Amino acid sequence: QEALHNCSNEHYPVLLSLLKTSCEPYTRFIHDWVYSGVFRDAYGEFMIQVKLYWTHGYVVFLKHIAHDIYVCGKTINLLKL
Amino acid sequence: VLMKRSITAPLAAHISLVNKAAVDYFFVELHLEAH
Amino acid sequence: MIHELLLALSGYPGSIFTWNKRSGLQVSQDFPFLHPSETSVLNRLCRLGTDYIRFTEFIEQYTGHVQQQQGQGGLHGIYLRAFCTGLDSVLQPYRQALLDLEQEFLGDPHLSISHVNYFLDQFQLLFPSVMVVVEQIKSQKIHGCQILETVYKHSCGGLPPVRSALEKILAVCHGVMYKQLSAWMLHGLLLDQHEEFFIKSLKQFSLRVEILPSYIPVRVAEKILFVGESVQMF
């Protein structure tokens, strides 16, 4: 929200460079669940977290693509079975 | 402009492959259509 | 007398040039070193420094005092901060003049008041004209796109230096409107929060016809609104 608040001033490249590195471990986290579907978090910054195979949990950055990741990992994890 | 959708286009192409494989995996191999 | 006046004009109040809000800077007028002969020169120089203190005070008060947050364009808001940002950059030659002055006093310490009045004559008319242009904006709580019109009408004057000077700040405020418009027409993404940039699927947008700047007629704004609604729809 700090990006959309101020984007036409001198603090625009510094804030963009801050947000671009504040999401760098997040891309590794997503870079797991796109190809394998193995849980990685011990920080509480991840919202895809730990019957009929829907007993893992799921709860601003774009929530529109997160649920897609939650199901795109679980297919690869289904072919492990 | 603030957009994070430029990365979604090199990602949705794999999202679609995974989804199509998931629906195909039931019917041609586990034979839910026969049941 | 020498460094003291440059101290006062820079925006830190002097002890001889006592900072008041109702008389600005005023020379102490009680020394047996001063006289009607030199007093008038000091008052004429003090006009520019009083305006400069007010300028820096307003710019500081409204640049970098919040995360841009609700906010109104008379107090908060992107347009007013853009005005302060442009106002600092037009004031850069005055800073250069004061810095140059101290170097000349270092080269020879015997220079008179006529030299500094003579060099600073070109600012002597430029500061009073722009002062009321910003004063009307501050007093009336002018919100939204009307700020651009308010400085725009007095940059339709008959004084060339004031025209160039006000036109620079107006370019700065256009920049923030244009930065928000460069997404919304082509994506639909507003980048403006709690201010007006004169446009607000199948609907959900409407033209703010009342706020729309006078040099931007209603016809072009309808094409803008059409483009935004369409890109939102598909």
Side-chain angles (χ1 to χ4, degrees):
Chain A
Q1 305 164 138
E2 199 45 62
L4 288 179
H5 284 348
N6 183 225
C7 76
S8 182
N9 201 11
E10 63 196 12
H11 322 295
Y12 175 55
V14 178
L15 272 173
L16 186 72
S17 317
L18 280 164
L19 171 64
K20 273 296 194 78
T21 196
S22 156
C23 310
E24 290 302 347
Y26 189 78
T27 46
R28 302 200 320 255
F29 282 17
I30 300 304
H31 193 274
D32 311 337
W33 281 70
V34 167
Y35 306 136
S36 87
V38 185
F39 178 58
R40 173 196 189 163
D41 176 62
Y43 310 98
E45 64 196 41
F46 189 54
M47 48 185 281
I48 303 173
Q49 62 89 39
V50 54
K51 71 171 175 175
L52 76 163
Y53 191 69
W54 281 116
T55 47
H56 302 103
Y58 180 84
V59 181
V60 58
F61 183 74
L62 293 172
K63 308 170 268 185
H64 301 163
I65 306 296
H67 180 60
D68 291 331
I69 303 297
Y70 169 53
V71 69
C72 276
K74 286 183 71 149
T75 291
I76 303 296
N77 194 210
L78 184 89
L79 301 169
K80 310 290 177 188
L81 308 163
Chain B
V1 55
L2 273 300
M3 48 184 312
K4 313 283 183 175
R5 203 164 44 178
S6 310
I7 302 176
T8 310
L11 183 71
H14 182 89
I15 292 178
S16 44
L17 194 63
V18 163
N19 282 12
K20 181 68 181 294
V23 188
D24 173 53
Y25 169 70
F26 293 127
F27 303 133
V28 298
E29 186 185 337
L30 273 47
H31 302 302
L32 271 77
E33 186 175 356
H35 303 156
Chain C
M1 286 78 78
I2 301 300
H3 182 62
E4 172 74 57
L5 187 46
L6 303 183
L7 190 150
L9 302 164
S10 280
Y12 301 129
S15 44
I16 306 306
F17 304 97
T18 54
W19 176 239
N20 186 27
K21 187 56 72 72
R22 335 187 305 276
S23 63
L25 296 169
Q26 182 63 253
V27 318
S28 93
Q29 274 307 123
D30 43 19
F31 293 112
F33 308 136
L34 63 81
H35 265 293
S37 51
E38 73 190 20
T39 293
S40 36
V41 188
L42 296 167
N43 301 132
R44 268 181 187 84
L45 299 172
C46 276
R47 308 175 185 182
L48 313 167
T50 296
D51 304 346
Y52 198 79
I53 295 168
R54 295 276 205 114
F55 294 156
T56 42
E57 165 174 278
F58 166 80
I59 291 161
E60 189 275 333
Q61 178 169 14
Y62 292 121
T63 313
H65 65 101
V66 68
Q67 300 300 120
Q68 266 196 337
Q69 307 277 354
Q70 185 44 232
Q72 307 293 311
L75 299 156
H76 308 131
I78 186 157
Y79 279 95
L80 165 143
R81 184 177 282 178
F83 201 100
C84 307
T85 296
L87 194 57
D88 195 19
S89 46
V90 297
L91 283 168
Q92 176 70 272
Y94 193 78
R95 314 174 139 193
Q96 312 160 355
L98 265 68
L99 295 177
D100 171 270
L101 273 161
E102 183 62 55
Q103 170 76 41
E104 302 200 282
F105 282 117
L106 302 189
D108 168 51
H110 304 306
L111 296 182
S112 74
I113 61 175
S114 82
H115 282 270
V116 64
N117 184 19
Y118 153 69
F119 289 132
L120 275 294
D121 203 8
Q122 65 178 356
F123 294 100
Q124 190 61 263
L125 75 165
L126 172 64
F127 279 13
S129 67
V130 299
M131 179 70 183
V132 287
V133 183
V134 308
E135 175 68 54
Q136 298 179 34
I137 299 172
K138 293 195 305 185
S139 45
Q140 302 169 39
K141 318 298 295 184
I142 297 172
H143 162 65
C145 320
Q146 300 301 99
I147 299 169
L148 322 180
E149 284 193 68
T150 310
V151 72
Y152 175 50
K153 296 306 173 175
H154 313 137
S155 52
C156 306
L159 296 158
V162 197
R163 172 160 198 115
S164 316
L166 297 176
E167 179 162 18
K168 301 310 293 307
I169 300 170
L170 195 50
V172 184
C173 314
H174 288 104
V176 314
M177 185 268 319
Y178 278 136
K179 168 64 74 69
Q180 299 150 337
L181 186 52
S182 44
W184 184 92
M185 262 206 283
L186 263 177
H187 298 70
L189 300 188
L190 75 161
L191 307 182
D192 193 13
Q193 286 71 240
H194 51 259
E195 292 295 312
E196 282 174 288
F197 68 122
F198 57 81
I199 44 96
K200 180 153 62 56
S201 281
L202 311 158
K203 194 31 208 67
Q204 308 306 128
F205 301 148
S206 313
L207 163 66
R208 308 151 156 154
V209 71
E210 68 274 15
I211 197 64
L212 177 64
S214 48
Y215 54 94
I216 300 170
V218 62
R219 196 262 321 167
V220 201
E222 285 159 36
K223 310 290 167 297
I224 298 287
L225 180 69
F226 165 80
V227 160
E229 274 215 359
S230 89
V231 70
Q232 181 63 47
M233 282 153 57
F234 55 78

PDB file of all heavy atoms in Angstrom, chain A residues 15-44:
ATOM      1  N   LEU A  15      11.459   3.643  -2.789  1.00  0.00           N
ATOM      2  CA  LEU A  15      10.387   2.783  -2.286  1.00  0.00           C
ATOM      3  C   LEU A  15      10.191   1.557  -3.170  1.00  0.00           C
ATOM      4  O   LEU A  15       9.917   0.459  -2.665  1.00  0.00           O
ATOM      5  CB  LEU A  15       9.074   3.561  -2.182  1.00  0.00           C
ATOM      6  CG  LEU A  15       8.755   4.338  -0.902  1.00  0.00           C
ATOM      7  CD1 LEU A  15       7.494   5.171  -1.095  1.00  0.00           C
ATOM      8  CD2 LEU A  15       8.602   3.400   0.284  1.00  0.00           C
ATOM      9  N   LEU A  16      10.325   1.722  -4.494  1.00  0.00           N
ATOM     10  CA  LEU A  16      10.227   0.571  -5.388  1.00  0.00           C
ATOM     11  C   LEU A  16      11.389  -0.394  -5.176  1.00  0.00           C
ATOM     12  O   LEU A  16      11.202  -1.614  -5.178  1.00  0.00           O
ATOM     13  CB  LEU A  16      10.163   1.025  -6.848  1.00  0.00           C
ATOM     14  CG  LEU A  16       9.918  -0.122  -7.838  1.00  0.00           C
ATOM     15  CD1 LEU A  16       8.486  -0.642  -7.741  1.00  0.00           C
ATOM     16  CD2 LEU A  16      10.258   0.283  -9.263  1.00  0.00           C
ATOM     17  N   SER A  17      12.595   0.138  -4.956  1.00  0.00           N
ATOM     18  CA  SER A  17      13.754  -0.710  -4.696  1.00  0.00           C
ATOM     19  C   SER A  17      13.666  -1.384  -3.331  1.00  0.00           C
ATOM     20  O   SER A  17      14.258  -2.449  -3.126  1.00  0.00           O
ATOM     21  CB  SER A  17      15.035   0.117  -4.801  1.00  0.00           C
ATOM     22  OG  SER A  17      14.995   0.977  -5.928  1.00  0.00           O
ATOM     23  N   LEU A  18      12.943  -0.776  -2.388  1.00  0.00           N
ATOM     24  CA  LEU A  18      12.714  -1.414  -1.095  1.00  0.00           C
ATOM     25  C   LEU A  18      11.707  -2.552  -1.217  1.00  0.00           C
ATOM     26  O   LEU A  18      11.929  -3.651  -0.693  1.00  0.00           O
ATOM     27  CB  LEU A  18      12.236  -0.378  -0.077  1.00  0.00           C
ATOM     28  CG  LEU A  18      13.317   0.494   0.557  1.00  0.00           C
ATOM     29  CD1 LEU A  18      12.672   1.698   1.210  1.00  0.00           C
ATOM     30  CD2 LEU A  18      14.130  -0.302   1.563  1.00  0.00           C
ATOM     31  N   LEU A  19      10.581  -2.298  -1.897  1.00  0.00           N
ATOM     32  CA  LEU A  19       9.556  -3.324  -2.071  1.00  0.00           C
ATOM     33  C   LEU A  19      10.044  -4.467  -2.957  1.00  0.00           C
ATOM     34  O   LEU A  19       9.650  -5.622  -2.751  1.00  0.00           O
ATOM     35  CB  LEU A  19       8.282  -2.695  -2.647  1.00  0.00           C
ATOM     36  CG  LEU A  19       7.133  -3.593  -3.119  1.00  0.00           C
ATOM     37  CD1 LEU A  19       6.517  -4.385  -1.968  1.00  0.00           C
ATOM     38  CD2 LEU A  19       6.074  -2.787  -3.854  1.00  0.00           C
ATOM     39  N   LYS A  20      10.931  -4.173  -3.914  1.00  0.00           N
ATOM     40  CA  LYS A  20      11.450  -5.209  -4.797  1.00  0.00           C
ATOM     41  C   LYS A  20      12.375  -6.177  -4.076  1.00  0.00           C
ATOM     42  O   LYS A  20      12.449  -7.344  -4.469  1.00  0.00           O
ATOM     43  CB  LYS A  20      12.185  -4.575  -5.978  1.00  0.00           C
ATOM     44  CG  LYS A  20      11.287  -4.219  -7.157  1.00  0.00           C
ATOM     45  CD  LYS A  20      10.672  -5.459  -7.776  1.00  0.00           C
ATOM     46  CE  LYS A  20      10.057  -5.160  -9.135  1.00  0.00           C
ATOM     47  NZ  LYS A  20      11.093  -5.053 -10.199  1.00  0.00           N
ATOM     48  N   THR A  21      13.061  -5.737  -3.019  1.00  0.00           N
ATOM     49  CA  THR A  21      13.831  -6.674  -2.219  1.00  0.00           C
ATOM     50  C   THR A  21      13.070  -7.186  -1.008  1.00  0.00           C
ATOM     51  O   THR A  21      13.455  -8.223  -0.462  1.00  0.00           O
ATOM     52  CB  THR A  21      15.173  -6.074  -1.775  1.00  0.00           C
ATOM     53  OG1 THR A  21      16.037  -7.127  -1.317  1.00  0.00           O
ATOM     54  CG2 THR A  21      14.976  -5.087  -0.644  1.00  0.00           C
ATOM     55  N   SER A  22      11.978  -6.534  -0.607  1.00  0.00           N
ATOM     56  CA  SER A  22      11.130  -7.087   0.442  1.00  0.00           C
ATOM     57  C   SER A  22      10.315  -8.283  -0.033  1.00  0.00           C
ATOM     58  O   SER A  22       9.722  -8.977   0.801  1.00  0.00           O
ATOM     59  CB  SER A  22      10.197  -6.007   0.994  1.00  0.00           C
ATOM     60  OG  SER A  22       9.039  -6.570   1.585  1.00  0.00           O
ATOM     61  N   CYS A  23      10.264  -8.536  -1.343  1.00  0.00           N
ATOM     62  CA  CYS A  23       9.614  -9.714  -1.898  1.00  0.00           C
ATOM     63  C   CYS A  23      10.596 -10.739  -2.465  1.00  0.00           C
ATOM     64  O   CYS A  23      10.157 -11.687  -3.120  1.00  0.00           O
ATOM     65  CB  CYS A  23       8.608  -9.316  -2.988  1.00  0.00           C
ATOM     66  SG  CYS A  23       7.426  -8.002  -2.567  1.00  0.00           S
ATOM     67  N   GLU A  24      11.908 -10.589  -2.236  1.00  0.00           N
ATOM     68  CA  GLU A  24      12.857 -11.539  -2.826  1.00  0.00           C
ATOM     69  C   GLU A  24      12.826 -12.955  -2.237  1.00  0.00           C
ATOM     70  O   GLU A  24      12.953 -13.910  -3.023  1.00  0.00           O
ATOM     71  CB  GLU A  24      14.292 -10.989  -2.797  1.00  0.00           C
ATOM     72  CG  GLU A  24      14.623  -9.813  -3.727  1.00  0.00           C
ATOM     73  CD  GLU A  24      14.396 -10.027  -5.236  1.00  0.00           C
ATOM     74  OE1 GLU A  24      14.186 -11.171  -5.697  1.00  0.00           O
ATOM     75  OE2 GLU A  24      14.432  -9.021  -5.978  1.00  0.00           O
ATOM     76  N   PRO A  25      12.712 -13.189  -0.913  1.00  0.00           N
ATOM     77  CA  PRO A  25      12.550 -14.590  -0.475  1.00  0.00           C
ATOM     78  C   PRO A  25      11.186 -15.171  -0.815  1.00  0.00           C
ATOM     79  O   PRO A  25      11.043 -16.402  -0.906  1.00  0.00           O
ATOM     80  CB  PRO A  25      12.768 -14.517   1.044  1.00  0.00           C
ATOM     81  CG  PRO A  25      13.537 -13.273   1.254  1.00  0.00           C
ATOM     82  CD  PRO A  25      12.965 -12.326   0.261  1.00  0.00           C
ATOM     83  N   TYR A  26      10.186 -14.307  -1.010  1.00  0.00           N
ATOM     84  CA  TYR A  26       8.846 -14.752  -1.372  1.00  0.00           C
ATOM     85  C   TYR A  26       8.827 -15.436  -2.732  1.00  0.00           C
ATOM     86  O   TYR A  26       8.084 -16.404  -2.925  1.00  0.00           O
ATOM     87  CB  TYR A  26       7.893 -13.555  -1.363  1.00  0.00           C
ATOM     88  CG  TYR A  26       6.436 -13.915  -1.515  1.00  0.00           C
ATOM     89  CD1 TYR A  26       5.714 -14.421  -0.441  1.00  0.00           C
ATOM     90  CD2 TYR A  26       5.777 -13.737  -2.727  1.00  0.00           C
ATOM     91  CE1 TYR A  26       4.376 -14.749  -0.570  1.00  0.00           C
ATOM     92  CE2 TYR A  26       4.440 -14.061  -2.867  1.00  0.00           C
ATOM     93  CZ  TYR A  26       3.745 -14.566  -1.784  1.00  0.00           C
ATOM     94  OH  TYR A  26       2.414 -14.889  -1.918  1.00  0.00           O
ATOM     95  N   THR A  27       9.651 -14.967  -3.673  1.00  0.00           N
ATOM     96  CA  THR A  27       9.705 -15.598  -4.987  1.00  0.00           C
ATOM     97  C   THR A  27      10.351 -16.977  -4.917  1.00  0.00           C
ATOM     98  O   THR A  27       9.982 -17.868  -5.683  1.00  0.00           O
ATOM     99  CB  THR A  27      10.444 -14.705  -5.982  1.00  0.00           C
ATOM    100  OG1 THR A  27      11.655 -14.220  -5.391  1.00  0.00           O
ATOM    101  CG2 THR A  27       9.570 -13.526  -6.384  1.00  0.00           C
ATOM    102  N   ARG A  28      11.287 -17.184  -3.984  1.00  0.00           N
ATOM    103  CA  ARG A  28      11.820 -18.527  -3.744  1.00  0.00           C
ATOM    104  C   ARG A  28      10.752 -19.438  -3.147  1.00  0.00           C
ATOM    105  O   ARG A  28      10.640 -20.621  -3.512  1.00  0.00           O
ATOM    106  CB  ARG A  28      13.026 -18.458  -2.807  1.00  0.00           C
ATOM    107  CG  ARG A  28      14.175 -17.594  -3.284  1.00  0.00           C
ATOM    108  CD  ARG A  28      15.454 -17.976  -2.553  1.00  0.00           C
ATOM    109  NE  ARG A  28      15.204 -18.253  -1.140  1.00  0.00           N
ATOM    110  CZ  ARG A  28      15.533 -17.435  -0.145  1.00  0.00           C
ATOM    111  NH1 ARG A  28      16.136 -16.283  -0.401  1.00  0.00           N
ATOM    112  NH2 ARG A  28      15.263 -17.771   1.109  1.00  0.00           N
ATOM    113  N   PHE A  29       9.973 -18.891  -2.204  1.00  0.00           N
ATOM    114  CA  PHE A  29       8.879 -19.636  -1.578  1.00  0.00           C
ATOM    115  C   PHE A  29       7.866 -20.097  -2.621  1.00  0.00           C
ATOM    116  O   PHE A  29       7.429 -21.254  -2.619  1.00  0.00           O
ATOM    117  CB  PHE A  29       8.172 -18.769  -0.529  1.00  0.00           C
ATOM    118  CG  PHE A  29       8.903 -18.629   0.793  1.00  0.00           C
ATOM    119  CD1 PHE A  29      10.251 -18.940   0.938  1.00  0.00           C
ATOM    120  CD2 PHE A  29       8.211 -18.166   1.904  1.00  0.00           C
ATOM    121  CE1 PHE A  29      10.889 -18.788   2.158  1.00  0.00           C
ATOM    122  CE2 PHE A  29       8.841 -18.018   3.126  1.00  0.00           C
ATOM    123  CZ  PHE A  29      10.181 -18.328   3.253  1.00  0.00           C
ATOM    124  N   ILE A  30       7.504 -19.198  -3.538  1.00  0.00           N
ATOM    125  CA  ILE A  30       6.596 -19.538  -4.630  1.00  0.00           C
ATOM    126  C   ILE A  30       7.286 -20.444  -5.648  1.00  0.00           C
ATOM    127  O   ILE A  30       6.655 -21.335  -6.230  1.00  0.00           O
ATOM    128  CB  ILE A  30       6.053 -18.236  -5.257  1.00  0.00           C
ATOM    129  CG1 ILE A  30       5.304 -17.418  -4.203  1.00  0.00           C
ATOM    130  CG2 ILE A  30       5.115 -18.506  -6.419  1.00  0.00           C
ATOM    131  CD1 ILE A  30       4.182 -18.168  -3.520  1.00  0.00           C
ATOM    132  N   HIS A  31       8.603 -20.299  -5.813  1.00  0.00           N
ATOM    133  CA  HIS A  31       9.443 -21.098  -6.693  1.00  0.00           C
ATOM    134  C   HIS A  31       9.588 -22.544  -6.216  1.00  0.00           C
ATOM    135  O   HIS A  31      10.098 -23.396  -6.954  1.00  0.00           O
ATOM    136  CB  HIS A  31      10.813 -20.415  -6.802  1.00  0.00           C
ATOM    137  CG  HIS A  31      11.690 -20.933  -7.898  1.00  0.00           C
ATOM    138  ND1 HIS A  31      12.517 -22.023  -7.738  1.00  0.00           N
ATOM    139  CD2 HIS A  31      11.894 -20.488  -9.160  1.00  0.00           C
ATOM    140  CE1 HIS A  31      13.183 -22.236  -8.859  1.00  0.00           C
ATOM    141  NE2 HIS A  31      12.822 -21.319  -9.738  1.00  0.00           N
ATOM    142  N   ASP A  32       9.158 -22.823  -4.986  1.00  0.00           N
ATOM    143  CA  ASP A  32       8.942 -24.199  -4.537  1.00  0.00           C
ATOM    144  C   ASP A  32       7.605 -24.765  -5.011  1.00  0.00           C
ATOM    145  O   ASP A  32       7.570 -25.781  -5.712  1.00  0.00           O
ATOM    146  CB  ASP A  32       9.012 -24.287  -3.012  1.00  0.00           C
ATOM    147  CG  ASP A  32      10.222 -23.601  -2.450  1.00  0.00           C
ATOM    148  OD1 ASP A  32      11.208 -23.440  -3.197  1.00  0.00           O
ATOM    149  OD2 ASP A  32      10.186 -23.226  -1.261  1.00  0.00           O
ATOM    150  N   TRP A  33       6.493 -24.116  -4.644  1.00  0.00           N
ATOM    151  CA  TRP A  33       5.162 -24.684  -4.861  1.00  0.00           C
ATOM    152  C   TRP A  33       4.703 -24.646  -6.314  1.00  0.00           C
ATOM    153  O   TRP A  33       3.577 -25.058  -6.593  1.00  0.00           O
ATOM    154  CB  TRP A  33       4.118 -23.959  -4.007  1.00  0.00           C
ATOM    155  CG  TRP A  33       4.080 -24.382  -2.571  1.00  0.00           C
ATOM    156  CD1 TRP A  33       5.031 -24.138  -1.625  1.00  0.00           C
ATOM    157  CD2 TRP A  33       3.034 -25.109  -1.909  1.00  0.00           C
ATOM    158  NE1 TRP A  33       4.648 -24.670  -0.419  1.00  0.00           N
ATOM    159  CE2 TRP A  33       3.426 -25.272  -0.565  1.00  0.00           C
ATOM    160  CE3 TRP A  33       1.807 -25.640  -2.323  1.00  0.00           C
ATOM    161  CZ2 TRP A  33       2.638 -25.944   0.368  1.00  0.00           C
ATOM    162  CZ3 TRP A  33       1.023 -26.307  -1.392  1.00  0.00           C
ATOM    163  CH2 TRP A  33       1.443 -26.453  -0.064  1.00  0.00           C
ATOM    164  N   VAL A  34       5.500 -24.135  -7.240  1.00  0.00           N
ATOM    165  CA  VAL A  34       5.097 -24.206  -8.636  1.00  0.00           C
ATOM    166  C   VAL A  34       5.592 -25.507  -9.274  1.00  0.00           C
ATOM    167  O   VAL A  34       4.901 -26.086 -10.122  1.00  0.00           O
ATOM    168  CB  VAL A  34       5.583 -22.936  -9.368  1.00  0.00           C
ATOM    169  CG1 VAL A  34       5.484 -23.045 -10.883  1.00  0.00           C
ATOM    170  CG2 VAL A  34       4.761 -21.743  -8.896  1.00  0.00           C
ATOM    171  N   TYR A  35       6.717 -26.044  -8.802  1.00  0.00           N
ATOM    172  CA  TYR A  35       7.301 -27.242  -9.391  1.00  0.00           C
ATOM    173  C   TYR A  35       7.213 -28.482  -8.502  1.00  0.00           C
ATOM    174  O   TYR A  35       7.316 -29.597  -9.026  1.00  0.00           O
ATOM    175  CB  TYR A  35       8.765 -26.989  -9.765  1.00  0.00           C
ATOM    176  CG  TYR A  35       8.999 -25.787 -10.658  1.00  0.00           C
ATOM    177  CD1 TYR A  35      10.047 -24.909 -10.406  1.00  0.00           C
ATOM    178  CD2 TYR A  35       8.187 -25.541 -11.761  1.00  0.00           C
ATOM    179  CE1 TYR A  35      10.277 -23.813 -11.223  1.00  0.00           C
ATOM    180  CE2 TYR A  35       8.409 -24.445 -12.584  1.00  0.00           C
ATOM    181  CZ  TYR A  35       9.456 -23.587 -12.308  1.00  0.00           C
ATOM    182  OH  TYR A  35       9.684 -22.498 -13.118  1.00  0.00           O
ATOM    183  N   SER A  36       7.066 -28.340  -7.181  1.00  0.00           N
ATOM    184  CA  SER A  36       7.028 -29.543  -6.351  1.00  0.00           C
ATOM    185  C   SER A  36       5.867 -29.625  -5.363  1.00  0.00           C
ATOM    186  O   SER A  36       5.235 -30.678  -5.234  1.00  0.00           O
ATOM    187  CB  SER A  36       8.338 -29.669  -5.574  1.00  0.00           C
ATOM    188  OG  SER A  36       8.269 -28.945  -4.358  1.00  0.00           O
ATOM    189  N   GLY A  37       5.559 -28.525  -4.680  1.00  0.00           N
ATOM    190  CA  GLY A  37       4.551 -28.555  -3.633  1.00  0.00           C
ATOM    191  C   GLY A  37       5.015 -29.105  -2.294  1.00  0.00           C
ATOM    192  O   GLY A  37       4.351 -29.971  -1.714  1.00  0.00           O
ATOM    193  N   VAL A  38       6.145 -28.614  -1.788  1.00  0.00           N
ATOM    194  CA  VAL A  38       6.663 -28.987  -0.471  1.00  0.00           C
ATOM    195  C   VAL A  38       6.662 -27.733   0.396  1.00  0.00           C
ATOM    196  O   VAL A  38       7.089 -26.662  -0.056  1.00  0.00           O
ATOM    197  CB  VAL A  38       8.071 -29.603  -0.558  1.00  0.00           C
ATOM    198  CG1 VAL A  38       8.536 -30.100   0.808  1.00  0.00           C
ATOM    199  CG2 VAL A  38       8.092 -30.745  -1.563  1.00  0.00           C
ATOM    200  N   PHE A  39       6.170 -27.865   1.631  1.00  0.00           N
ATOM    201  CA  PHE A  39       5.999 -26.720   2.520  1.00  0.00           C
ATOM    202  C   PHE A  39       7.337 -26.128   2.944  1.00  0.00           C
ATOM    203  O   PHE A  39       8.231 -26.836   3.417  1.00  0.00           O
ATOM    204  CB  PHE A  39       5.200 -27.130   3.761  1.00  0.00           C
ATOM    205  CG  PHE A  39       5.007 -26.017   4.760  1.00  0.00           C
ATOM    206  CD1 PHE A  39       4.376 -24.837   4.392  1.00  0.00           C
ATOM    207  CD2 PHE A  39       5.450 -26.156   6.070  1.00  0.00           C
ATOM    208  CE1 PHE A  39       4.192 -23.813   5.311  1.00  0.00           C
ATOM    209  CE2 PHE A  39       5.269 -25.137   6.993  1.00  0.00           C
ATOM    210  CZ  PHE A  39       4.640 -23.965   6.612  1.00  0.00           C
ATOM    211  N   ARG A  40       7.468 -24.813   2.770  1.00  0.00           N
ATOM    212  CA  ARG A  40       8.608 -24.078   3.297  1.00  0.00           C
ATOM    213  C   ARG A  40       8.129 -22.749   3.856  1.00  0.00           C
ATOM    214  O   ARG A  40       7.751 -21.847   3.099  1.00  0.00           O
ATOM    215  CB  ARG A  40       9.685 -23.829   2.235  1.00  0.00           C
ATOM    216  CG  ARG A  40      10.808 -22.920   2.734  1.00  0.00           C
ATOM    217  CD  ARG A  40      11.644 -22.357   1.601  1.00  0.00           C
ATOM    218  NE  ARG A  40      12.826 -21.663   2.107  1.00  0.00           N
ATOM    219  CZ  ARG A  40      13.888 -21.356   1.369  1.00  0.00           C
ATOM    220  NH1 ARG A  40      13.923 -21.679   0.084  1.00  0.00           N
ATOM    221  NH2 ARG A  40      14.917 -20.727   1.921  1.00  0.00           N
ATOM    222  N   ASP A  41       8.145 -22.656   5.189  1.00  0.00           N
ATOM    223  CA  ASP A  41       8.005 -21.431   5.970  1.00  0.00           C
ATOM    224  C   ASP A  41       8.325 -21.762   7.421  1.00  0.00           C
ATOM    225  O   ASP A  41       7.958 -22.835   7.909  1.00  0.00           O
ATOM    226  CB  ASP A  41       6.591 -20.842   5.877  1.00  0.00           C
ATOM    227  CG  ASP A  41       6.400 -19.626   6.768  1.00  0.00           C
ATOM    228  OD1 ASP A  41       7.094 -18.611   6.551  1.00  0.00           O
ATOM    229  OD2 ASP A  41       5.557 -19.688   7.686  1.00  0.00           O
ATOM    230  N   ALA A  42       9.018 -20.865   8.114  1.00  0.00           N
ATOM    231  CA  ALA A  42       9.112 -20.950   9.565  1.00  0.00           C
ATOM    232  C   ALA A  42       9.044 -19.547  10.150  1.00  0.00           C
ATOM    233  O   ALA A  42       9.562 -19.293  11.241  1.00  0.00           O
ATOM    234  CB  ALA A  42      10.396 -21.661   9.992  1.00  0.00           C
ATOM    235  N   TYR A  43       8.384 -18.639   9.434  1.00  0.00           N
ATOM    236  CA  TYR A  43       8.441 -17.220   9.757  1.00  0.00           C
ATOM    237  C   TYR A  43       7.048 -16.643   9.957  1.00  0.00           C
ATOM    238  O   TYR A  43       6.879 -15.644  10.663  1.00  0.00           O
ATOM    239  CB  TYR A  43       9.167 -16.451   8.650  1.00  0.00           C
ATOM    240  CG  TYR A  43      10.495 -17.051   8.245  1.00  0.00           C
ATOM    241  CD1 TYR A  43      10.596 -17.874   7.127  1.00  0.00           C
ATOM    242  CD2 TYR A  43      11.647 -16.793   8.979  1.00  0.00           C
ATOM    243  CE1 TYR A  43      11.809 -18.426   6.753  1.00  0.00           C
ATOM    244  CE2 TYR A  43      12.864 -17.338   8.612  1.00  0.00           C
ATOM    245  CZ  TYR A  43      12.939 -18.154   7.499  1.00  0.00           C
ATOM    246  OH  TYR A  43      14.147 -18.698   7.131  1.00  0.00           O
ATOM    247  N   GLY A  44       6.048 -17.261   9.342  1.00  0.00           N
ATOM    248  CA  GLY A  44       4.712 -16.703   9.370  1.00  0.00           C
ATOM    249  C   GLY A  44       4.488 -15.627   8.333  1.00  0.00           C
ATOM    250  O   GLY A  44       3.674 -14.721   8.550  1.00  0.00           O
TER     251      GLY A  44
END
